[PDB]
Amino acid sequence: AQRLMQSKQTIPHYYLSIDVNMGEVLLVRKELNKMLEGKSKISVNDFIIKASALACLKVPEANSSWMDTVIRQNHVVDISVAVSTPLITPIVFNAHIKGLETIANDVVSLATKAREGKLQPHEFQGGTFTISNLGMFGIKNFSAIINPPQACILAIGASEDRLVPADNEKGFDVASMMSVTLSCDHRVVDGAVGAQWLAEFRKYLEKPITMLL
Amino acid sequence: FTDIPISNIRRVIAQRLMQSKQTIPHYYLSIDVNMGEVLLVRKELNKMLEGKSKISVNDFIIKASALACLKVPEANSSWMDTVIRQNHVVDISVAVSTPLITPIVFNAHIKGLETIANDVVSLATKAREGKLQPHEFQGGTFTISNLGMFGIKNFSAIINPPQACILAIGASEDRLVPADNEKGFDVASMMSVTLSCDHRVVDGAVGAQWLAEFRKYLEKPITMLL
Amino acid sequence: FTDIPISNIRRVIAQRLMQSKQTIPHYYLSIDVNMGEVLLVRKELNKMLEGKSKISVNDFIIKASALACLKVPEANSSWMDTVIRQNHVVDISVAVSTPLITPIVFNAHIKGLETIANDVVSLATKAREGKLQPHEFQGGTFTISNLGMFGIKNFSAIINPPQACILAIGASEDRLVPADNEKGFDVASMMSVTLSCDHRVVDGAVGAQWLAEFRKYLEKPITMLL
Amino acid sequence: FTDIPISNIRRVIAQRLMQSKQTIPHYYLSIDVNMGEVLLVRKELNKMLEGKSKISVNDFIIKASALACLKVPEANSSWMDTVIRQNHVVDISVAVSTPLITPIVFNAHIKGLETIANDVVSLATKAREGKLQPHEFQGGTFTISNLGMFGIKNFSAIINPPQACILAIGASEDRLVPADNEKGFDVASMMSVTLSCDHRVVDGAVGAQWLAEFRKYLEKPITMLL
């Protein structure tokens, strides 16, 4: 509670939100999972980890961390993933380097240890970024609370089918949307640079082929 | 008739070629890789780049081979007396014709596909039109040589003294492939890939695994996300 | 990075293999053999056996190569200083992957096709999960190594020190072959066979005869009755 | 079993063959050449010859290789210590099976196509049933070895000590080639060509140029007029 309250009253929060098309992602997931052949399961959340991680490299300002009299900058992106615990934030190191499937193995092992065991204190403290997912409970959109040292945090809603105008004789088709909400420390993340990171994240996720960079 | 004195630059090269070839026993492997999927991917990437930079088919080979080395670390290792030296990082060296030099691309298993294309262009331009610092082209952990630009179907190369593997790349062809169509066939593009291995380190079975793994990565570029 | 000390087993193989390649000159050959007739015969033999044992496609290669050695005894010989040694019996050594060992099948030119299948299975089981007597895998008069199980199209292999020839077998494939049909073609399975010969003993002409003779035996299994 | 003493004729061949492989590094190249046009030209000339002389498909290779050497003089050179010897003439040596000798055809880049056919026939007749002067068959500036008459698809050959290149020729096949017809293909003959080069003198780039230049001459016998 102390950290949560302090973070809110010391860090001025301002939020952004967009809608990301997930039609292309599901097609890729069917192939990869098929390629895995049961070796590993790649969740839709796993694509979010790498897509956000690479977006941090292209926009390093969002990955930074505010300190008094000096703005600390991080060239590595250790992304922390929030998981419900009867709430803990395990850390995935070098999210901008390691492969897509190894992230899935890492998150599964950490989640199992988190829910049914003890984590070493450094393994869930001092992350350079945070991602929290609530789509499993049907939440359309929400805003989160940032960690004290960090500068941004992602919020992910549930995916749903929405009509999209099309050139079809019928004039439309069905595409699965989802809403992404980002909370930024306005001292470090300006409106323009924050918009660039969220727009850059959309382009990576809207076409998984571009994730090869 | 005419006699031409040897240059000192070529002298060392000759020494290395002969020595590396003779000291190391070389056994060669070869396969054929389908290029239908890569060309489709290259069209999408180059279109989305909107002229910022161009990704060559050779750029896909660099990353695909680099990830294959991680999955089969034996091919990425090096041989020394009384110790087999294992390399955890992959520094792929790309051969380019020079009136022959081997610029080194560091961390090919980590850096993105597009940055590889920028790196190879800058190094190649510097190699042809200028001077390279000696470390920049000495001590690679792997080597790739491309001759498909001259119409060579297939060939075999000569390894560097410290390395353990080297790829040989032929030209992209157009060959009939049996299919389930009413015509029973369709046109598909194939490239032959030849690998030369030091049999002291790389056995037949492990060498086959690396080459087969390389085929799977290149035959479906989506899997390069791993 | 990581350095691995070399085991004596690797050390014995390394110096044995390196000496063979740096001493024996190697010239190679390659042909394509049709598998249309072989597969049909395998279906009949395996069916009639009613599950007693399974005859592998590799087993047909053993006898077909063995009978080819009888018709071309020059390839079956062995090089010694000041005297070329000729072998009348044909002991064929088959290479099997081992985390690489070469069990020896004796009198391959005499024993029947099915007994070869039983022999190769028993030896391979002992090779992977047991101890084999040295002679049982030393001093073979011929060598066959198969890598078709890993998708390798074609490759060349190193020779043993005392031997004179070695067969390299690629993976079976499906390739179009021109025909007199209204479509002008039909689908027929092919495979590439690569032979490495010591040019001191095996000349180009005699080497071609052995490989061509091997094709005729394997292209029509009825002819293996001799 | 049987032991055979080594003859001195095979003995003198041995060291020359022994020294060549362990002293000259070896790298090989390979392509596929369409032989469709040549056959059409051969029918006309043989007709024109009216039985006066016969022109084999091998005869076209002699002149095509000879003219290729003029356009790429590096492949025609010879490696000496501390000096790269250069040849402005192309004395092509043709290999013929002998119960293996290399008759030399002098000035192959100058003399006419039919005169080569008469020369190769007379020399082969003198070689097999007669005696030849050592020079007549020693000191060639280039070598061509043919094994397509036995059905070999492709092979690689050992290089002579003083030379820098050697050609290997496979058998003429029949392969499907994609076309613009309503059937989408047509039958066209092919011929695999393998070139073996000393890597000290012949780099990959210059070697590819010679093989490609040889390819262009052979696809269209009109171009041999230079």
Numbering used by the authors:
A (entry chain 2c): 433 to 518, 521 to 647
B (entry chain 2e), C (entry chain 2g), D (entry chain 2f): 420 to 518, 521 to 647
What does the paper say about this structure?
The α-keto acid dehydrogenase complex family catalyzes the essential oxidative decarboxylation of α-keto acids to yield acyl-CoA and NADH. PDC, OGDC, and BCKDC are each comprised of multiple copies of a substrate-specific dihydrolipoamide acetyltransferase (E2p), dihydrolipoamide succinyltransferase (E2o), or dihydrolipoamide acyltransferase (E2b) inner catalytic (IC) core surrounded by multiple copies of the respective α-keto acid dehydrogenase (E1p, E1o, or E1b) and universal dihydrolipoamide dehydrogenase (E3) components. In addition, despite sharing a similar monomeric fold, OGDC and PDC E2 cores have distinct interdomain and intertrimer interactions, which suggests a means of modulating self-assembly to mitigate heterologous binding between mismatched E2 species.
The pyruvate dehydrogenase complex (PDC; components suffixed by ‘p’) is an essential element of life that catalyzes the oxidative decarboxylation of pyruvate to acetyl-coenzyme A (acetyl-CoA). We initially identified PDC based on its distinct icosahedral architecture. This is confirmed by atomic model building of the bovine E2p sequence into the icosahedral cryo-EM density map, which showed good agreement between the sequence and the respective side chain densities. Adjacent to the region of missing density, a putative density for the lipoyl moiety was identified near the catalytic residues Ser566 and His620′ and the gatekeeper residue Leu521. The E2p knob has one hydrophobic surface that binds a single hydrophobic pocket in the socket. Heterogeneity of E3BP distribution precludes identification and experimental structural determination of E3BP from native mammalian PDC.
